[PDB]
C-alpha cells in the first residue's frame, strides 16, 4: 500500500493548571500538514505544509470548528476515564487517539485505523473489519458496549472508506512534487578505531524520504542482527530523515563486513564496504 493519512490527538489533564490541553496533528505519510493547539494565543487548525495552504476559508473554519468540538469531547472523556478507573480529580492523565486510512497505488482503501490509549496504554481499537472493537480492559469494555449500541463503528467506516480516502487522494495530487517523490539515502561508511584491537564501522543513511528504511550489517555474508547498534530514525528538519547502524569489528577484519541499505527511493538495494 502506497500512502497513508493519519490524525493524532493528545488530550492532557493538569488539575490546578486549567482545562486539559488538546493538541492535534495531521500527516500524509511522513509529512505533517496541519496542527491545532488549544493553548495557542488564537487556536485554529493551521497549515504546516505548503500544498495545504491553497485550501479556502471554508476548509480552515470547518477544521477549526471540528478541533474545538473535539477538544471539548476529549475533556469529557478524561473525566469519564477517571470514573472508569476509580481515579481522583487530583492527578494528570492523557488520552491519545490515532486514526486514518491507507491507500494502494490505485488510490483504493487498503485499510482503516482508529485506536485510543489512556495513560500511554491501549484502551480500545477499531478492528480491521471497520465493524467491531477490541477493548484492552474492563473499562474499555464499557465504552465498547456504548459504541456498539450507538453504531459508532459504522460512522468511522463511512469516513474511512469515503472522505478519508477522497481527501488523501486530493492532498496527494496537490502535493505531488513532494508527497509522491521518494528521496533515496546518501550513504557512506565511516571507521572509528576504539583500540588497537577493535574499530567501529558506522553505516550512514542521510537525506532520505520517506522514513522507512532498512540498514543491516553482514559479516562474511551473515546478518549481524544481535551485534548491530541501530539508532532510531531521526528527522533532519528539512523533511528528510537520518539513520545509522554500527558494528564493533576486530582490527584487520573490516573488509569482511558489508552494509546493506534498502529504501523505496533506490532502484535496488545497496551494498557498502569501508
Amino acid at each position: 500500500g502506497s500512502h497513508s493519512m493519519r490524525y493524532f490527538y493528545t488530550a492532557m489533564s493538569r488539575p490546578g493548571r486549567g482545562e486539559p490541553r488538546f493538541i492535534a496533528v495531521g500527516y500524509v505519510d511522513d509529512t505533517q500538514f496541519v496542527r491545532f493547539d488549544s493553548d495557542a494565543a488564537s487556536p485554529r487548525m493551521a497549515p504546516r505544509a505548503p500544498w495545504i495552504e491553497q485550501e479556502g476559508p471554508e476548509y480552515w473554519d470547518g477544521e477549526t470548528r471540528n478541533m474545538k468540538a473535539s477538544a471539548q469531547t476529549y475533556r469529557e472523556n478524561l473525566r469519564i476515564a477517571l470514573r472508569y478507573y476509580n481515579q481522583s480529580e487530583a492527578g494528570s492523565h492523557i488520552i491519545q487517539v490515532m486514526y486514518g486510512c491507507d491507500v494502494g497505488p490505485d488510490g483504493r482503501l487498503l485499510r482503516g485505523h482508529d485506536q485510543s490509549a489512556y495513560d500511554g496504554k491501549d484502551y480500545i481499537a477499531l478492528n480491521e473489519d471497520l465493524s467491531s472493537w477490541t477493548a484492552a480492559d474492563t473499562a474499555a469494555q464499557i465504552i465498547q458496549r456504548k459504541w456498539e449500541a450507538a453504531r459508532v463503528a459504522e460512522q468511522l467506516r463511512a469516513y474511512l472508506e469515503g472522505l478519508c480516502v477522497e481527501w488523501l487522494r486530493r492532498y496527494l495530487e496537490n502535493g505531488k512534487e513532494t508527497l509522491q517523490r521518494a528521496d533515496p539515502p546518501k550513504t557512506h561508511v565511516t571507521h572509528h578505531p576504539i583500540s588497537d584491537h577493535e574499530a567501529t564501522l558506522r553505516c550512514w543513511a542521510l537525506g532520505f524520504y520517506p522514513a522507512e528504511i532498512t540498514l543491516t550489517w553482514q559479516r562474511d555474508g551473515e546478518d549481524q542482527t544481535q551485534d548491530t547498534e541501530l539508532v532510531e530514525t531521526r528527522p533532519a528538519g528539512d523533511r528528510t530523515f537520518q539513520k545509522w547502524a554500527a558494528v564493533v569489528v576486530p582490527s584487520g577484519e573490516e573488509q569482511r563486513y558489508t552494509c546493506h541499505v534498502q529504501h523505496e527511493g533506490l532502484p535496488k538495494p545497496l551494498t557498502l564496504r569501508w
Binding site: 492535534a24 477544521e63 471540528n66 472523556n77 459508532v152 460512522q155
Partner: peptide
C-alpha cells in the same frame, strides 16, 4: 480532512 461525526463518540 479530519473525522467530523454528528455526535463525537464519548467514552
Amino acid at each position: 480532512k479530519a473525522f467530523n461525526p454528528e455526535i463525537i463518540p464519548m467514552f
